[PDB]
């Protein structure tokens, strides 16, 4: 055997009872799988690498080059115990074998790599939905060893993060990849060191505009055509107004089916409900005209009405002003 595995007890970390052993980390991101709004989490697949030195794995050689083993010797030597904080579920690929790489240098330097898929939670805000921007992060920490036994740091600082050129999302735009570092404290175990991977996401507005905003505007303009119809056709104008109200209500209900039960109103809800009020007022507009006409005929017994003439101009002006204000605030 090139390595004297049986001659050492690997139940203790290198430098047991002494100073902490530094550990390096390199991360390459492969792809992002899915994002859930109701569950507020994301899925990521990445390659995780570790760097440390152990004199117990030294072997004699003359070339001074790294040597690669099959990978099943990992379960017989000491390995760090990094874990993902605030994660919901994760696993390691095992086809056709465990995705494990083990390279040992003659002086004892060890390279360890893994391929994992991790799901982590992220707190999102939907105040500006669907024109919002979300930021999420991934955390890496050691579970068992504190800062007095193991020191965790990025292997090459800002250059330790790499991303595949094929990473893309159908509904989101990915940008601003960077890493940071911060300490963590637990009241009953001590202090630990954490590593962060940050990114930013931006939605695409084309789908929401075509599916929600355009149908809403068309329904509002449909109610305006009743002002150009003669008021004597009562069974012809009343159904027009009512059907528009019912259609607008159906549109509002269908939008909320794909969003969670938040406690605050979203930007899309404001636009839909304001449009509902405009259509509702249109129905009441004809009711006033009909009542006044009946009273006028009764008084006389014992042309275009003024309300209709002014409604032709006031209603389009108010809606256009609302759009200018609404789109200026939300850009």
């Amino acid at each position: 055997q090139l390595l004297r595995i049986d001659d050492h007890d690997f139940s203790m970390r290198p430098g047991f009872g002494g100073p902490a052993i530094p550990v390096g980390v390199d991360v390459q991101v492969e792809s992002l799988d899915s994002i859930s709004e109701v569950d507020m989490d994301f899925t990521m697949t990445l390659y995780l690498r570790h760097y440390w030195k152990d004199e117990r794995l030294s072997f004699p050689s003359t070339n001074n080059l790294s040597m690669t083993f099959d990978g099943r010797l990992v379960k017989k030597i000491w390995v760090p115990d990094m874990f993902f904080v605030h994660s919901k579920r994760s696993f390691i690929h095992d086809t056709t074998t465990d995705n494990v790489m083990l390279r040992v240098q003659p002086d004892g330097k060890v390279l360890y790599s893994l391929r994992v898929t991790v799901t982590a939670m992220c707190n999102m805000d939907f105040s500006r939905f669907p024109l919002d921007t979300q930021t999420c992060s991934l955390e890496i920490e050691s579970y068992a060893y504190t800062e007095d036994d193991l020191m965790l740091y990025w292997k090459k600082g800002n250059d330790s993060l790499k991303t595949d050129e094929r990473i893309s999302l159908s509904q989101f735009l990915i940008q601003e990849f960077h890493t940071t570092t911060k300490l963590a404290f637990y009241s009953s175990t001590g202090w630990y060191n954490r590593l962060y991977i940050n990114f930013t996401l931006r939605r695409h507005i084309f789908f929401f505009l075509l599916q929600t905003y355009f149908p809403a505007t068309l329904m509002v303009m449909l109610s305006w055509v009743s002002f150009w119809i003669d008021r004597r056709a009562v069974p012809a104008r009343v159904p027009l107004g009512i059907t528009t109200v019912l259609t607008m209500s159906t549109i509002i209900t269908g939008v909320n089916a794909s969003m969670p039960r938040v406690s605050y109103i979203k930007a899309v809800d404001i636009y839909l409900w304001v449009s509902f009020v405009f259509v509702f007022l249109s129905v009441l507009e004809y009711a006033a005209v009909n009542y006044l006409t009946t009273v006028q005929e009764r008084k006389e017994q014992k042309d275009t009405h003024a309300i209709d003439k002014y409604s032709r101009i006031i209603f389009p002006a108010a809606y256009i002003l609302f759009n200018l204000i609404y789109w200026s605030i939300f850009s």
Copy 2:
């Protein structure tokens, strides 16, 4: 080897054949994942810690400080067998390794930690839905050892429970975390000791008001506009009343799709069905007026009707009185 594992039989608990061995528990709650109304359960992720003493794990040292091991030695020593009562499913994270911490003091004190995700059932009441308040609890108990072999208690009493500052729910408000203790009895095994973790939840009413209460009120007020229309436009008032009835029926059906099949009526159902009656009576109101007008014309052959004039005042008054009573009982 620092620990003489092979020199002892760890198939028996410490103090075998004698007095019970005390065990301490510390719990830190990380996050709450989801709540299901149809399944009546919740998901929680937390850190579980154990405290006990075993003289068989003593090792000589001079510093008198805790020493940390990699964690795979756990399967070779005695470990408590705590389990969650009334749970449906649960698992332990194993990425990149099992989330296990093992610290042994020179005198034999042992610290054991785990990271688990547990789903437990909770009996909820929906008599005041969606303005209800729910209380749920989590139970921890030893499966194999009774009170005569193992004693279970909180390590620091009221101070043994900690919660993360990031715990939040989109639809619920979390409050009132506390712990209690109670004994349990089984008819064929004996007595056991249980530990409890309690919390309270409160819903948010904004979503339900906007999605259900507001559309219901608007439909009811839509039927009131028919009283101001001339009764001679029969094909103009009948469609107005009928379409409101159909729309109200659609609203009622859609609400129940997200709730289980309970055997009692909820608060939201009362409001919706009362509104349905109001719209239904509105349709019958015009039928009486039309019939009386036809009879009056026939009698004469051989203005505003009195029913319409009184309906303009009675109907709004009754609905407002209902709202005052309904919102006073349910606050």
Copy 3:
């Protein structure tokens, strides 16, 4: 070692080559999880206990009391091979360890306990849905040993079954827990002994009445208001009848979405389809009146119609008679 495990071959049952060894069973039911109508199965969680004697596990002592082991010694001794017949899926909880209890008396008596969750199929009949009553059972049998090698019986007869006081179902009522015993035969292995656990379930009718029966009745009574309207308002009565027909059709379609594709008609289907016929005949009623009026005017050229007057009384009488008969048969 207190037990001489290594001195015996546990690959053979006690009393190998001789008479059968009796085995006792005790069962305590914890909770019922869910019931599926489309899949026709139920999920149950329970505690399973076994009783037998093995002289190879005897150890010397003076107190003559049961001793409890950690539970990992089970995989080194002989254990029965009970399994659940007609089950679809099942598993054993393993958090934080396997829920296994092992107690051995000095004379060799052994107590073995497990905690499992089992899903078993049940053949249900929906002829009286939703006022039906269903009976299901759970079967326990030994897989490998016949009656000539292992005898299976209840430990205490009728007293071997216990149920938790917290067992409840939102939609069903649980009652009539009892156990029976019957033999089973296989054409190629021999005879076996089976154990049964039986229970009965009853649905709650409040949800079905409010969601289905009440809307159906209201729609039928809505068609009756057309008989009190003047027949000269043709565009006012025809839409009333047609909209009721379409609404009734929508109600019928939505009910079947939650039931499987059975080959027989259910009780709820009879009520809905009879109501559909009543509304359909109402539409045809006005068509006859309109045609006769046109013919009468044409004959004359060259008040209340008799059909309308009789329809006001005949239609309510027929529907009430149908309800009396329908509710008398199904109680």
Copy 4:
């Protein structure tokens, strides 16, 4: 030890380097779980048995009777490697232990049994849906050994297949169970022997008739009532025709939601689309009558129409003739 397991190398099949060893198979079917139309597969649970002889397992005895072992000795002896061809997923039950039976005769005959649940794909044709008939089969084959090393055959020919009396499907009728045998060839490994289990399935038509065919016919007959209404009530006949068209379109859309995206038209689609044409032509029928009446009045200025009179007879006759032809082809 009764069996000299440690004295032989079980890494080689019996008769290594010589003639093939015959293997027998017995199969008993327990139940069928589910059938998926979109995924085109079925799930089956069955008992699998094997028969072979191995002189290395011989033990001395005088009774000459089969002896049963606990079953964990299987992993220490040679076992066939049968697998299911064209399967998607499968597993073996392991509660409370692996469902494994091992019986060895004194001369060396071995009986091996297993309990598995297998999902296998089946190619179905929906040209006659929902009045179609489907045939599916299950395949058993050895993965590692060819015909020159292992010979596979049915233990008792036609009598090797047994079925439980409780096998039933809610939507399908099961019949025609039989077994066949055929060889298989691979271009790079050689020849193999396969075993087949065949069965036939037939759907139930009651659900489809009541849910789809009856509503379609009623809508078609609803359009026929407009021919008996006076043509002067234009706003009374036009809504009747249009609402029937929209309702028919809704029925057609809902049916396809439960079927995959096939590239050929089904039997149910033909009936629905022909009915849609009949209703569509009814709307065009009144348009011609209205236009001709207006032209006739204009010409005159400068009773029952002939089209309506003929439509009362032609339309019912055509639909009845279509039903006779449609139901004669599909029986």
Copy 5:
């Protein structure tokens, strides 16, 4: 033992510390399971084979023929570590045992086979939906060994890919199977060799035409019948136009439910929205005619209109011209 497994250390690859060891791959495709548009991935089941030589597995014989082992010896020898790049989930069938084949020649040649099901992502474009064509590929690569330690190549070049004759998709047409080879580079591990399997898919247009295109055209032609009706029947033409608009809106909404939220407009959306404009303009057409008639009567106070006469010809001509252009671009 025929193979001297215990006499070698299989933790190192053959030719350790020297030149790379060539590895051959053979692939036979069994079936394609499903394709998801929202998730943009596909599922494939295939047989994977490996070819290499290892002198440590040599055994003496005279026949010089391949010998087959049970397959559990794989976990005791060196095996390649191939994995699928850009995959989401995958597993290996294990019923009734692991689908593993191991054949070793006397000189040391080894044959290794597996049966796996792999889900891999594919980037699709929906600019021409539903008349689009998609291309997807599958990637195979070694995870641990670079090109300096292991060389990967196709065993027989273009002849190494085989497909089952039963491969079919209900909605897609499969064609153009071929394989390629390309190198891959990682910034922190080195260079690797990849293998590709490519295929092309084409949709079927029959379902989309019948379900979407035909209903859209019929609704457009329904609005054209209003031009042949007398303009004095105001309550008869206005409902016709409005109901067509609402029906067209319902059709548009239902189509997008089965597609993801892309940021570009599809071919089907263009056809639907253009038809919506045609129906919308039809409603405005009658409004102009009604207003002009009222003004003309008022001026006179103090036949067929010209707009209707021209609309009968202009509207059909424009729609036909649009269809010719639309179907010429998309073929």
